Amino acid sequence: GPVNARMTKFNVVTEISSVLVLTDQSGAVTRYSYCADGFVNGLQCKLRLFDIPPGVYSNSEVEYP
Amino acid sequence: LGDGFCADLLSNVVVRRMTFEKHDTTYVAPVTNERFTELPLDHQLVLTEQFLQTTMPKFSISCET
Ligand SMILES: *[C@@H]1O[C@H](CO)[C@@H](O)[C@H](O)[C@H]1NC(C)=O
């Protein structure tokens, strides 16, 4: 990429991801969160909720090779 | 065997009838004139057991797993 002034940015994807998304009235995504960026993010994708109220949430699972 | 029949398998194979022990009631009809009545002379103390299922474990299912 030719440097101007900046430069076009690049990201090589290595694996398949899960993403929770929120749509607006017209169906366009206005809020996302990747399911593996952290501990709370995995619970967000398990419950389909961005703002998790307090509670007891059962059967979160660990993946193994 | 069904239909009030039973198979006696002690000495040789015989088909007999089932019976049930006859019980009484605690309601006493009122005495309105002079007559005969049948009063008990003594009582037998009886223990009867009764099982009723009340509980199960709960299940959490990850159906994708
Ligand atoms: C859902 O869409 C409606 C219009 O259909 C509008 O009130 C708003 O964009 C959204 N409301 C909620 C509570 O999500």
Q: How far away is chain A from the Cα of B59, in angstroms, using its nearest Cα? A: 10
Q: What is the dihedral of CA B5, B10, B14, B17, to 10 degrees?
A: -30
Pair B17, B6: CB distance under 8 Å:
yes
Pair A47, A19: CB distance under 8 Å:
no
Q: What is the DSSP letter of A52?
A: P
Helix (H/G/I), strand (E/B), else coil: B33: coil
Q: How far away is chain A from the Cα of B61, in angstroms, using its nearest Cα? A: 8
Helix (H/G/I), strand (E/B), else coil: B37: coil
Method: cryo-EM
b/e sequence A23-53, b meaning 16+ C-beta within 10 Å: eeeeeeeeeeeeeeeeeebbebebeeeeeee
Q: Which residues pair with residue A33 across a beta bridge?
A: A20
Residue B50: C-alpha distances to residues A63, B1, B44, B46, B53 (Å): 47, 25, 19, 13, 10
C-alpha A25/C-alpha A27 separation (Å) is 6
Helix H or strand E encompassing B15: strand B14-17
Helix H or strand E encompassing A43: helix A39-47
Q: What is the Å distance from ligand 1's center to A23 Cα?
A: 10
Residue written as tokens 């979160």?
A: A60
| Resolution value (Å, 1 decimal) | 2.4
